[PDB]
Structure 1
Amino acid sequence: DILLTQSPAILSVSPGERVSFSCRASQSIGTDIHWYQQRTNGSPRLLIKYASESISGIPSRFSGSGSGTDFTLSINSVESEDIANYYCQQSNRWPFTFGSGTKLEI
């Protein structure tokens, strides 16, 4: 079963900065990585599918990149509403698994 490592577990940035979350898979999984955002008391929300593809209604400052084992979710110019926990999820092999999450602090 594929371990997804999200490190560091907390990222601290200043408003307007570009930030990058890391997700490393324990084996090669092509681009079958998906990213979710979960705010305090909220349900998870899909941000990026298949490592880099946009979702309708997600602000354009969100992007994703990587393939194989190394994946990055990036935010251009962080702002306050981006304060949340961020999870990656793989669908390359059964069962689907989740990363342990990165908290964004401003």
Structure 2
Amino acid sequence: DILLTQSPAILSVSPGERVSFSCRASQSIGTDIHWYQQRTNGSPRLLIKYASESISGIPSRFSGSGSGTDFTLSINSVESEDIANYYCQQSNRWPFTFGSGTKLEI
């Protein structure tokens, strides 16, 4: 079972600033990582697939990068609607697994 480590758990940033969420896999998994956003009382939302690919309907400020065991979800000019929980998920080996999540805080 691939282990995805998200750290720090909580992230604090000032409005407008660029922020970077981190996800490290217990083993090389290519670019088979994906990001989801979950706001309070809401369900998960695919933000980035296969590490970097963007999803239509998702603000262009959201971008991702990395490969192997290190991945980063980044967000330019952070704004209040960006306040929620982030999670990573790998599809490299069965079974799929999730990160422990990271809370964004402005």
Q: TM-score range by the shorter chain?
A: over 0.9
TM-score normalised by L of structure 2: 1.00
Cα distance in 1 for residues equivalent to 2:87 and 2:69: 15
1:26 aligns to 2:31 (yes or no): no
Q: Once superposed, which parts of structure 1, at least 4 consecutive aligned residues long, lie more than 2 Å away?
A: none
Q: CA deviation at 1:56?
A: 0.4
Cα distance in 1 for residues equivalent to 2:47 and 2:6: 16
Unpaired runs of at least 5, structure 1: none
- Structure 2 SS opposite 1:88: strand
1:68 aligns to 2:83 (yes or no): no
Unpaired runs of at least 5, structure 2: none
Cα distance in 2 for residues equivalent to 1:13 and 1:44: 22
**Seq. identity, %:** 100
- Structure 1 SS opposite 2:11: strand
1:72-102 C-alpha deviation (Å, 9 max, x unpaired)? 0000000000000000000000000000000
Q: CA deviation at 1:48?
A: 0.1
TM-score normalised by L of structure 1: 1.00
Cα distance in 2 for residues equivalent to 1:62 and 1:103: 16
Q: How many residues align?
A: 106
Cα distance in 2 for residues equivalent to 1:99 and 1:21: 11
